Task: inverse folding
């Protein structure tokens, strides 16, 4: 009785399942761009509060957003408010906290897990943990927590055991997200891949070829969704990855975006 007629997909480029060379140019108005922030567009710093955002970063993101007609999103482990504090690009789509909060292109923000009483109990146990271990840093991120040990590398084992134990106590609601010198505890059932897939179901992203660039383990789920949709996944820096392309550094990734912009306008 009812049918499912599609319009020819606006994507004009498809990447196969193989390693790929980063293209010289992309049809910016038929491409969707998803970027991690720390370690991807900006260098990783000794602590989250110590990152340095060069002026090139907001200029390049905003030019890509103009030339692509809005199909640019940040998909970060930071909160949306933090991303806003560093880029100050009004109305930029942002998935923050690994997908635990998301602002769409209309400017509507959805959050899960904020004010959850279990997170406050987890936070209290981690606060006692970092009290006993100088050099560890507990970062409280709204609905998520980050247990840092970059300045206490000898405490990676105790950080892992504590975070794994607390997550297991609430395994129905929370999940562990390891990263570079950090263990993050975040609501279950949201991730960077799901956030990308949600963007790709909405204008202006829907139907476009997706690009996802990232540097850490959380970003592998973004690479997975970009690859499943025939797009271009870019790992920044060293490490095993499912990304189809790789660049050496934040500066080298920045240089790729700059070339795509120049080739566009
Ligand atoms: Cl993720
Ligand atoms: Mg990162």
Result:
């Amino acid at each position: 009785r009812t049918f499912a007629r599609r319009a020819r997909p606006p994507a004009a480029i498809l990447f196969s399942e193989s390693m790929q060379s980063i293209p010289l140019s992309l049809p910016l108005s038929r491409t969707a761009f998803f970027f991690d922030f720390d370690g991807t567009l900006v260098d990783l710093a000794p602590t989250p509060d110590a990152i340095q955002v060069p002026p090139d970063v907001p200029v390049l993101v905003d030019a890509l957003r103009q030339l692509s007609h809005g199909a640019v999103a940040i998909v970060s482990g930071r909160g949306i408010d933090s991303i806003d504090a560093y880029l100050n690009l009004p109305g930029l789509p942002v998935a923050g906290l690994h997908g635990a909060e998301r602002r769409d292109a209309n400017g509507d923000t959805q959050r899960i897990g904020f004010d959850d009483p279990r997170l406050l109990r987890i936070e209290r146990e981690l606060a006692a943990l970092v009290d006993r271990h100088p050099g560890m840093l507990l970062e409280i991120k709204g609905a998520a927590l980050a247990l840092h040990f970059r300045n206490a590398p000898e405490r990676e084992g105790v950080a892992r055991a504590a975070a794994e134990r607390l997550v297991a106590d609430y395994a129905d609601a929370y999940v562990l997200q390891p990263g570079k010198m950090v263990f993050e505890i975040k609501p279950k059932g949201v991730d960077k891949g799901r956030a990308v897939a949600a963007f790709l179901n909405e204008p202006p992203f829907a139907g476009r070829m997706p690009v996802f660039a990232g540097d850490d383990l959380t970003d592998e789920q973004g690479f997975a969704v970009a690859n499943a949709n025939g797009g271009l996944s870019i790992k920044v820096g060293a490490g095993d990855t499912t990304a189809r392309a790789r660049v050496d550094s934040v500066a080298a990734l920045r240089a790729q975006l700059a070339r795509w912009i120049a080739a566009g306008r």
